[PDB]
């Protein structure tokens, strides 16, 4: 698992979300 940020964001577009780092792992946000 990584904070791939650039790739994290593109993964999060699956639900239309922004992608962010939260300590070594990517997690999306409802904003």
Dump the DSSP string for the chain.
----THHHHHHHGGGT-EEEESSSSEEEE--
* Neighbouring residues of 20: CB distance < 8 A, sequence distance ≥ 6: 5, 8, 26, 27, 28, 29
CA distances 17 to 20, 24, 29, Å, are 10, 19, 6
Residue with the two structure tokens 């780092």: 21
User: Radius of gyration of the chain from Cα atoms?
Assistant: 8
Q: Which technique?
A: NMR
Distance, in Å, from the CA atom of 16 to the CA atom of 25, rounded to the nearest integer, reads: 19
Query: Which position has the token pair 């791939």?
Result: 4
């Amino acid at each position: 698992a990584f904070c791939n940020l650039r790739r994290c964001e593109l993964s999060c577009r699956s639900l239309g979300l922004l992608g962010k780092c939260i300590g070594e792992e990517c997690k999306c946000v409802p904003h």
